[PDB]
Design a binder for this molecule. Structure first.
Ligand SMILES: CC(C)CCC[C@@H](C)[C@H]1CC[C@H]2[C@@H]3CC=C4C[C@@H](OS(=O)(=O)O)CC[C@]4(C)[C@H]3CC[C@]12C
Ligand SMILES: CC(C)CCC[C@@H](C)[C@H]1CC[C@H]2[C@@H]3CC=C4C[C@@H](OS(=O)(=O)O)CC[C@]4(C)[C@H]3CC[C@]12C
Ligand SMILES: *[C@@H]1O[C@H](CO)[C@@H](O)[C@H](O)[C@H]1NC(C)=O
Ligand SMILES: *[C@@H]1O[C@H](CO)[C@@H](O)[C@H](O)[C@H]1NC(C)=O
Ligand SMILES: *[C@@H]1O[C@H](CO)[C@@H](O)[C@H](O)[C@H]1NC(C)=O
Ligand SMILES: *[C@@H]1O[C@H](CO)[C@@H](O)[C@H](O)[C@H]1NC(C)=O
Lengths: 208, 132, 236, 133
C-alpha cells in the first residue's frame, strides 16, 4: 500500500511504427509495438539514467536518488528499485544490444529475451544463446503488467506505452526525510519538464 | 541488382560481381513458385578444361546439398576451356517451388574446376517467403 | 598467396576507395554539442600509470545521449513530391551498394555508432582493464587502424569504411590533447547533386525537417548548436 | 565501514561482515603513511585449536604473499579454542607505508584452522594512492 512515494513516467513513441520479429530460420511472426523499438529503448534508457543522475540540494548537502529511493538489499546491493522494461536488460545498453547469430541472420536478440522474461521475470538466465538474466538490478523481479500498457490480453509485445516507476521511501515520523525527498522531487520535475524529444511523448507524475 | 556476398574461398578465381534478379532489397526475398536469375562475373586465375557448379543451402551452420538441373558450367554461359586471366559470367535461373519451406537460410554457390578447386565460392542471405 | 590477408587487403581497398571519392564539396549539416551539467573527470589506468584528464562532453552518459541524438537524426524522414526522403537517400555514402552506411563525422564513429561498443569493458571482478577511455586514446593517434592494441580489439574506422580524424570532431582542447575536448562536432555530409535539381530539392526538403527536429529537441544535459546548408540560400 | 567483498571459499565458516576503516568509498583508497583497521565478523562451523592469518596481494591475477606482523589469529581478537556455531571477530591494523607502490590490487585475506582450511576467505578491491580521487 502506502509508505511509498511514486515518481512515475508514461512514455509513448508517436513517430515510431510497429514492427515484426521473424524467428530464424522460420516460425510465427511476432508483432512488437512502437515503444518496443530498439532505438526507442536506448533513448528511454538514457532518460532513465539521466533521472538517476538528478541531484538536488537540501540542508547544505547534495541529495541524489540513491539517498531517498527504495533499496531493499542495502547496504550490500545499493541499487535503487526501478520498475521498467529496461530492467529486463539490467538497464544496460550492452545487454540491450546483445545479439547472437551467424554472419547473415540473428538467431537471438532483445526480442527473444523480452519474450522469455515477461513469462519468467525472476529468472536468472534466459534459455537462449544470450544467457542473460531477467532479474532487475535491485535484486527483484519486474512484472510485465506493471511496466507495459496498451497491450492486448497478455501479449505484452503489443504494448504501446512504457511505465517507469521510481519508488522512494515515504515517512510519517521523519519530516526531514520527507522534505529531502520533496526537494529531489522538485529537481526531478524541473528536469523532466525541460526534456523535449520529438520521438517520445512523456507524462510525468511526482508526489506533489 | 548487385547483391552483397561473402567469399567462402575462391582459390582459383576472383569474383567480380554476384547479380541476382529480381532482388530489390537484401537479404533476397524469394516468392514461392517464381523464377530468379543469378549471374556471377568472375576472373579465372588458372586454365581449366571443365567447370562443375555445386550449390548448398546452409541451415543452422550445416550445408544441405541442392541439385540443380545442369551442373556443368560450360553449358552455363562459360566458353570452355577456361583460360587464365579471362573474365566469365556464369548464368543460371532457378524456380522457387511451392514445396519449399518459408525459411531463412544461406545459399552457397561454388564452381569447381579440373583440380576440384573453387573458381568462385560465394554466399548470400536468402529468405523464401509466401505470396499469400 | 596468404589467404588470411583477405579481410585486411579488402578493408584497405575500401579505405582507398573512400578517400579517393570523398571529394572537396558537399552540403554540411552540423551540430556542436557541449555538456553544461557535467564536469571533467580523470581516467586512471590499471594497474597504475599517469592519470589522463577527460573533458565534460566525453563523459560516458553524455556520449550515450549524444549518440541517441545522432541515431535519431539519422532516422529523420521528410516528405516531398508525395514521396518519403530519408537521410540515406541523400547522404554521401561512397561505398554503396556494398556499404550503404551514411558518412557521419563524429567521435561516436570511433565506436561504430553503437551503444554496446561504447560500453565495451574488460577486467577482473573489481577493476576495469580497458574501456572506452583506452579505445578513444588509441584511435585519436591511429584513426585508420582496423583494431586497437588492447583487450577490446575494437576497430577505429567509422561505419562508412573510412577514418575519423580527431581534429574534425572535437573542439576546445589544448594542443593535441584531444581528451581535454570541451565540445563535440557532428557532421553529416550530403551529396551536392549539381546536374540533378530533383534530388537537390529532396536534400533541401530533408534539411528543413532536420532544422525543425533539432529545434524541437531539448535536453538539460546538452547544449546543441546546429547549422544546415539550407540556412545560406534561405537568406542572402 | 562494511565493505563489499568476494568470498574466495570459506569452507569452515560463514563471513558475517568485513569492516575496513577508514574507507568511506569503495574500492578502499589507501593513503601512503597511514593506518587502516580490519574487523571480520564470521561464524565458525567447526571446532579448531588454532588459526593462522594469511594475506595475499592479487596483482593481474597473481597472488603475492604479504607477511603480517602477527599471523597467529588467536592473538587477534579470537578466543581459542574456536567453538562451532559461535560468532567471532578477527581484528587487525596495518600501516600503508610510503615505499609501497601506488597501484590498484585485490587484497585477499584468509584465516586457516587445524585442517589448514579457511574459516573465512574474502577479497576486496584496494588502491594505494599518491593522491586521492
Ligand atoms: C541466386 C538465388 C536466387 C538462387 C535461388 C535458389 C534457391 C531457390 C534454392 C537454392 C538452395 C535451395 C535450398 C537448399 C536446401 C533446402 C533444404 C530443404 O529441406 S528439406 O526438409 O527438404 O531436407 C528444403 C529446400 C531448401 C530450403 C532449398 C530451397 C530452394 C533453394 C533456396
Ligand atoms: C585494511 C586492509 C583491507 C588494507 C591494509 C592492508 C594493505 C595496506 C596491505 C595488504 C596487502 C598488501 C600488499 C601485498 C602485496 C604487495 C605486492 C608487493 O610487490 S613486490 O613485487 O614488491 O613484492 C608490493 C606491496 C604490496 C602491494 C602490498 C601493499 C600493502 C598491502 C596492500
Ligand atoms: C552478366 O553480368 C555481366 C557483368 O555485369 C554482363 O556483362 C552480362 O551481360 C550479364 N549477363 C546477362 C545474361 O545479362
Ligand atoms: C570436391 O571438393 C569439394 C570441396 O570444395 C568437396 O566437398 C567434394 O567432396 C569434392 N568432390 C570430389 C569428387 O572430390
Ligand atoms: C568488530 O565488528 C563487529 C561487527 O558488529 C562488532 O560487533 C565489534 O564490536 C567490532 N570490534 C571492534 C574492536 O571494533
Ligand atoms: C594451506 O592451504 C592453502 C590453501 O588453502 C595453501 O596455499 C597452503 O600451501 C597450505 N599449507 C600451508 C599454509 O602450510
Amino acid at each position: 500500500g502506502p509508505f511509498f512515494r511514486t515518481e512515475q513516467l508514461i512514455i509513448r513513441a508517436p513517430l515510431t511504427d510497429k514492427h515484426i520479429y521473424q524467428p530464424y530460420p522460420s516460425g510465427a511472426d511476432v508483432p512488437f509495438g512502437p515503444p518496443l523499438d530498439i532505438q526507442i529503448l536506448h533513448q528511454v534508457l538514457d532518460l532513465q539514467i539521466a533521472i538517476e543522475n538528478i541531484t538536488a540540494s537540501y540542508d547544505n548537502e547534495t541529495v541524489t536518488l540513491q539517498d531517498i529511493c527504495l533499496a531493499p538489499l542495502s547496504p550490500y546491493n545499493t541499487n535503487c528499485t526501478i520498475l521498467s522494461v529496461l530492467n529486463y536488460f539490467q538497464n544496460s545498453h550492452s545487454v540491450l544490444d546483445h545479439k547472437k547469430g551467424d554472419d547473415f541472420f540473428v538467431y537471438a536478440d532483445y526480442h527473444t529475451h523480452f519474450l522469455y522474461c515477461v513469462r519468467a521475470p525472476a529468472s536468472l538466465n534466459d534459455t537462449s544463446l544470450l544467457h542473460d538474466p531477467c532479474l532487475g538490478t535491485f535484486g527483484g523481479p519486474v512484472f510485465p503488467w506493471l511496466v507495459l500498457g496498451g497491450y492486448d490480453d497478455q501479449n505484452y509485445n503489443n504494448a504501446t506505452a512504457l511505465v517507469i516507476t521510481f519508488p522512494v521511501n515515504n515517512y510519517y515520523n521523519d519530516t526531514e526525510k520527507l522534505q529531502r525527498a520533496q526537494a529531489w522531487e522538485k529537481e526531478f520535475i524541473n528536469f523532466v519538464k525541460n526534456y523535449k524529444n520529438p520521438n517520445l511523448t512523456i507524462s510525468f507524475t511526482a508526489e506533489r | 541488382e548487385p547483391v552483397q556476398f561473402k567469399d567462402c574461398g575462391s582459390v582459383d578465381g576472383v569474383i567480380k560481381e554476384v547479380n541476382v534478379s529480381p532482388c530489390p532489397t537484401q537479404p533476397c526475398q524469394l516468392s514461392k513458385g517464381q523464377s530468379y536469375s543469378v549471374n556471377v562475373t568472375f576472373t579465372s586465375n588458372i586454365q581449366s578444361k571443365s567447370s562443375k557448379a555445386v550449390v548448398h543451402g546452409i541451415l543452422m551452420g550445416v550445408p544441405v546439398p541442392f541439385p540443380i538441373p545442369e551442373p556443368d558450367g560450360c553449358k552455363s554461359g562459360i566458353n570452355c576451356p577456361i583460360q587464365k586471366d579471362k573474365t566469365y559470367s556464369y548464368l543460371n535461373k532457378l524456380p522457387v517451388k511451392s514445396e519449399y519451406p518459408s525459411i531463412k537460410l544461406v545459399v552457397e554457390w561454388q564452381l569447381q574446376d579440373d583440380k576440384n578447386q573453387s573458381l568462385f565460392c560465394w554466399e548470400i542471405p536468402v529468405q523464401i517467403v509466401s505470396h499469400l
